[PDB]
């Protein structure tokens, strides 16, 4: 039996419904999300890390000059400096005063920490969304399965079939380009490979962590040795990766709206409340019992003993009850006014049971079903206290929730007075226009 | 930190993040006298009550002014026939309702 | 210099231009596009093939009755047939009369032909588009290169930067559901995982070619082994692959519009002649030449010697040129009215050379530029007398092509006659409106 609904995309709180086949005892199902993951399809543009500017040992020729040549290396620089006259230990080294030239070449390469820490540039697409759902229905205990949230893919949870999706909103926390570092992601607009800007984020761009090719724009100037000593002095823009680490933005793990943590291994966006999901569940026919075997309840009345519109289950009500036979019966309130904590209630012959609920209305007028029979419970709630609370709201607020049946009375008397004066003026015009336009002749 | 009904997640140092939710528990009495009513709803919904009050004073003003205009119009259209014709009898019902001076 | 243009996304037609950076000779550019590879990103949803029903050996327990569990197997049946007297050779195989057990286990699994043939079902996305292109400029010979069709990709063709901007139209032959079979694809919706309709397509649905889970759904039923012969008679719907082959639709490649052929191993539609392409080609500056070096050409006179508006270049014409000095010229018409067969003409003095061209207008008016000069020539063309031929259309037809310059005369004189008659009326109304009203006065 196929039953369709819409459930809010809110992870913790269960979603209770009563699927009802006429002629069978209505069986009570519960759908609880425990993961909802927005998994984008990504590809690795490149990775970046601190660089190391290795300097080969310079070649110094006496009484004669070498020349510079170019080798296929990232940010390779050669500069032959003249008249060096080096002074090593154990005497001067190069005989000829002047006509002494040092090659002094450098080049840039991935540091030995790239393999450990390295930002990864990713370009993301719409991707897919999937979730872990926990199902209960009738006597069948909780059974969990992973489902794809799209309108088509079903999932055989136990013996029921479940189709979840699409999300009502296609929102995803990730922009086109993202960068993952450590365990946090950033919505950075990283330079397209091969356009690095010498020290802001792209200064080392290796397609993969172990790619021989490498792009490097560290602005490696090569200064001359001075004072007759042997070394290769270079000036260089500091690591763009270091600058990025210092001036790193707030991570998306801390800035994402709707409150979803970012996990890493598939790059999920986990458990954020955007919109709602349709539910289409096919309950097995074998889980439906005939009506005759299940209690039928009549002569009902419900009296809300206590109720405070707190986030938790701050409402206790009792129901006067007469039945056809003893047994266990499900309970549910279809409307969004109140959510019932109890699912089923044992029922004697001509007893009176109690149930708990959470509501957001000052005046919770809601309808409650007990085995195909509805009762209206009115109550009058009272303000909670203690302000900040650690657990989420178990109910959904509506615009007409806080009106407290005197404020209703006030807007009633106001609109009534306003309309009454207006209509009185209208009837005044009628009577004057009647006695005068006509009825003077 | 202004914590709304939608909740607030705060992380302090290396402590694990903590989520807090602000249940709609304000000052003011939803029932009873008008002043307590308006203060309870102002603490609940500040902007909504301000615009709602402004709208309500606006609608009562325009209705009251239009009503009094209609009424005074009818008053004129009642008296003027008799005003203009001083020598007739002004029917007592009209005399008291479209309240009238007795002319000569 | 950078030259930008747009071009028909046609497969054999060359696209001819002249880059003109001032103070230099015009230089002749040719682009030829040799395949159009529209590569859609796809995900394999599930594969399918003929089923095969393995019926393990029945359990014949003689006196008494066993029961069998639901072991997890695709479309598994197990039903105990009570009252069996299995009567083999050399004795009946059981010593009881009645109260004997025939367990009738049946079980369905992927056939071995699935290894070699399988109608694998994908889900098409937007993907990327790329093409193999062939350039010719100046005196440089042909230079070919594959290119991603998106503005953001240098794609250096030789020594020039070629940027091919995103294809004007985003049409793709493939809908979101496609099923690949053998050497062809089908634009068919596929009842996806676990929605198998039990007998048309999705009788078997295996997540990959070698997957341990298999959503068989084949409506296997088991019957009583007749008359005490040991066997497991099973009745069930024939294979969905059978009926899908018999009632297979027309393959997409036989239905794909815009002459779109399909290849398989990237699942790409080639030669797809929809819409147009922008082009931005940054040519080397060295291939240019100073105008002051270039020959002067003057007193140009071109005469069409015979034309007939065929697809192939069915017009021959002659240009009498007079010259400054030996040298090369490019000749192309800057307007679509003609396409010139000859890329370059390398030319001596004081002479009269012939060029072939193709056109569909019945009085072409090409303005053809020889060596940064101009000459306009026109004349009648006649119907080329073949009906259907196999050469595609070299020229592009425009609406003002077929009018035979008497019909042009006819519509001109007609429209003039209407306009002038109305004007004569307007003049008559004005002149009577004044001569006869205001002057009599
Ligand atoms: C489903 O819910 C039950 C009860 O709340 C719990 O024991 C079980 O662990 C849940 N499933 C998962 C996958 O967490
Ligand atoms: C480029 O065009 C020329 C024209 O003759 C052709 O020979 C050549 O094969 C084309 N390039 C490629 C890669 O086919």
Residue numbers in the entry:
A (entry chain D), C (entry chain A): 1 to 441
B (entry chain E): 316 to 419
Verbatim from the authors:
Alphavirus spike proteins comprise trimers of heterodimers of glycoproteins E2 and E1 that mediate binding to cellular receptors and fusion of virus and host cell membranes during entry. We recently identified very-low density lipoprotein receptor (VLDLR) and apolipoprotein E receptor 2 (ApoER2) as cellular receptors for EEEV and a distantly related alphavirus, Semliki Forest virus (SFV). Here, we use single-particle cryo-electron microscopy (cryo-EM) to determine structures of the EEEV and SFV spike glycoproteins bound to the VLDLR ligand-binding domain and found that EEEV and SFV interact with the same cellular receptor through divergent binding modes.
To determine the structure of VLDLRLBD-Fc-bound to EEEV VLPs, we used the block-based approach, which involves subparticle extraction, and focused our analysis on the quasi-threefold (q3) spikes. The global resolution of q3 spikes focused on this receptor-bound cleft was 3.5 Å. For model building and interpretation, based on our mapping studies of EEEV–VLDLR LA repeat interactions, we used the VLDLR LA1 sequence. However the cryo-EM density we observed likely reflected a mixture of different LA repeats. The cryo-EM structure revealed that VLDLR LA repeats bind clefts formed by adjacent E2–E1 protomers on EEEV. In the structure of the complex, two basic residues in EEEV E2, K156 and R157, make the most prominent contacts with VLDLR. Both are found in the central arch of the E2 β-ribbon connector, an E2 subregion that folds from two polypeptide segments that interrupt the connections between E2 domains A and B, and B and C. The aliphatic portion of the EEEV E2 K156 side chain makes hydrophobic contacts with LA1 W50, and the E2 K156 side chain ε-amino group interacts with the side chains of LA1 D53 and D57. E2 R157 interacts with the side chain of LA1 D55 and, nearby, the H155 side chain interacts with the LA1 D57 side chain. The adjacent spike protein protomer (E2’–E1’) seems to make minimal contacts with the face of the LA repeat that contains the short β-hairpin and is less conserved, and these interactions only involve backbone atoms on the receptor.
